[PDB]
Protein: Neuroglobin
Amino acid sequence: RPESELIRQSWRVVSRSPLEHGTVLFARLFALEPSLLPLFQYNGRQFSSPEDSLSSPEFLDHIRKVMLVIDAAVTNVEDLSSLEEYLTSLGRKHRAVGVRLSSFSTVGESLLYMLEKSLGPDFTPATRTAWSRLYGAWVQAMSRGWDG
Ligand code: HEM
Structure:
């Protein structure tokens, strides 16, 4: 696919600094949906503000985890059938920690936002569309986690 090379190419720049870029993703995500903040409970504590999350080693570790799962999507983009079982469970894990499936659309918008801001001019409509199909496929995988 050429869809698959646009993903690879765009991913390369952000994948070099996953925490920086993942930090953009989650700052955006919290700006769009503040109610996600309380879902990250480390040490039984709740973050009061979005910026509290950025001081938390566990939250930042979660940013690294997120970027690794996305990087696995990019590597396996040509088929992606392959990650179906892993993603189904990851989806269930999130159902368990309290995430609504619908929240993953906001996640998608944050990812696209982060890519757009990092790529600027380079983020062509072909690229936006490729990433939307990829993520749409990804979230379909995950949605199995919700017993659906
Ligand atoms: C609505 C957005 C999200 C919320 C509220 C959320 C929250 C959480 C929480 C509370 C945990 C358990 C604590 C931890 O492991 O740090 C977790 C685990 C994890 N998350 Fe997320 N998460 C979100 C999105 C994502 C996304 C988009 C990805 C990847 C694309 C991801 C990847 C992971 C991974 C790999 C784990 C470890 C699960 C395990 O191995 O047990 N998360 N998430």
User: Anything to note?
Assistant: DSSP finds seven helices and no strands in the chain.
